[PDB]
Ligand binder design. Structure first.
Ligand SMILES: Nc1ncnc2c1ncn2[C@@H]1O[C@H](CSCC[C@H](N)C(=O)O)[C@@H](O)[C@H]1O
Ligand SMILES: Nc1ncnc2c1ncn2[C@@H]1O[C@H](CSCC[C@H](N)C(=O)O)[C@@H](O)[C@H]1O
Lengths: 216, 208
């Protein structure tokens, strides 16, 4: 199982893009968050409710822990709400606790990439917009939305062409319209008759893709 | 859906038990913040991982199976405390706010608006009358959850024990369980084991 990156535009895979991710640093440098920085966000005149980097953190853990990741058939990108685009190497160990995650994101946003000790390989890297320049050549692009017709993921995946990847844009936000990828996507689809958290929408999509692709 | 509790011995449901869960107050003890204290407490600092319990609870209670009313969660902490989770509790999304809620629960023994409730061990005295008990573990044969679930009788619940511990043998349920099963050829985090079970049961029970 070779490690997938944007250089490979052929291999059929699943891609998840965590869009409108709230990853923004402020010098106290910390990753702005609604719990710790209410006072600051308020005196900044920002919407207190929108600084939710915990959503991106939880989605990353969900996604990189999944069997489809371990089987080498997942890539994740992050598009932040400030327009930064980040390619996540499949093998990166995202810190399990929010505090260490926050430290890692500050370093990434400042330096533009993170490598390991011992290796030049970038495990996280800021790359140039737009995301469509990096995705596979044959890639169905979908936004997940409560407001769109509900699909069974297995069925949807089984309808892909044999050489066609699937890129899912998921809003990594507490609230907002699901229009964040309307210029890239082919279709919007819902996964449930209930509204879901971004992380659960991620897990549900991954599970369905695992099932359709016989990844256990 | 009417809210499932252990009082109802009959309704077919999925139950997940977060076993060996690290939930202890001093704040919630955790490896990131309390390394110095843990080593004065002669503890393996790497065991204090309430983040795992936090993540599993978000995964479980956010799942369509919960929203359809067909899920119950219990937590068995590493100090032997048993907690029944009310299906309608809103788990705080951030770890800092999660800690604040657990602290209250552990001290007062109950949270209400009973959203969270300390109950008497063992967990098997609370389970539905007809209930298969399974431990999820990388070390057992690998099932497709949908198929395994479809094999339950029409009146038979399933209770899944998931290790919410940092590492360790999956023997935390050995004297309680009917069977051990694997969910993957790859090692899984506890929260991923949970979603895999929830999602396979959603597919088996036509919950969308
Ligand atoms: N039932 C559903 N089906 C598919 N995706 C969903 C969903 N419910 C939520 N999502 C996805 O999960 C993300 C975060 S949910 C928060 C934003 C959402 N627009 C709202 O107002 O509630 C959404 O952006 C969307 O990408
Ligand atoms: N491949 C797999 N199949 C089924 N369950 C798994 C699994 N991998 C992990 N789990 C569940 O997730 C829990 C946490 S993973 C950490 C515990 C693991 N026994 C270890 O020492 O490495 C496990 O206790 C198990 O209940």
């Amino acid at each position: 199982p070779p490690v997938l990156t944007s250089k490979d535009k052929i291999t059929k895979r699943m891609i998840v893009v965590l869009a409108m991710a709230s990853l923004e640093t402020h010098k106290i440098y910390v990753l702005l968050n609604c719990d710790d920085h209410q006072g600051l966000l308020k005196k900044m005149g920002r919407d207190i409710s929108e600084a939710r980097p915990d959503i991106t953190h939880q989605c990353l853990l969900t996604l990189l822990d999944s069997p489809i990741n371990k089987a080498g058939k997942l890539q994740v990108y992050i598009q932040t709400s400030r327009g930064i685009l980040i390619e996540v190497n499949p093998t990166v160990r995202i810190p399990r606790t929010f505090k260490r995650f926050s430290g890692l994101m500050v370093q990434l946003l400042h330096k533009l990439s993170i490598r390991s000790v011992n290796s030049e390989e970038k495990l996280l890297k800021v790359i140039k917009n737009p995301i469509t320049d990096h995705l596979p050549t044959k890639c169905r692009k979908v936004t997940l939305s409560f407001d769109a017709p509900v699909i069974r993921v297995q069925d949807y995946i089984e309808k892909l062409d044999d050489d066609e990847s699937i890129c899912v844009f998921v809003g990594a936000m507490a609230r907002g319209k699901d229009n964040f990828a309307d210029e890239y996507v082919d279709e919007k689809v819902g996964l449930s008759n209930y509204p879901l958290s971004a992380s659960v929408a991620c897990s549900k999509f991954c599970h369905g893709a695992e099932d359709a692709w016989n990844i256990l």
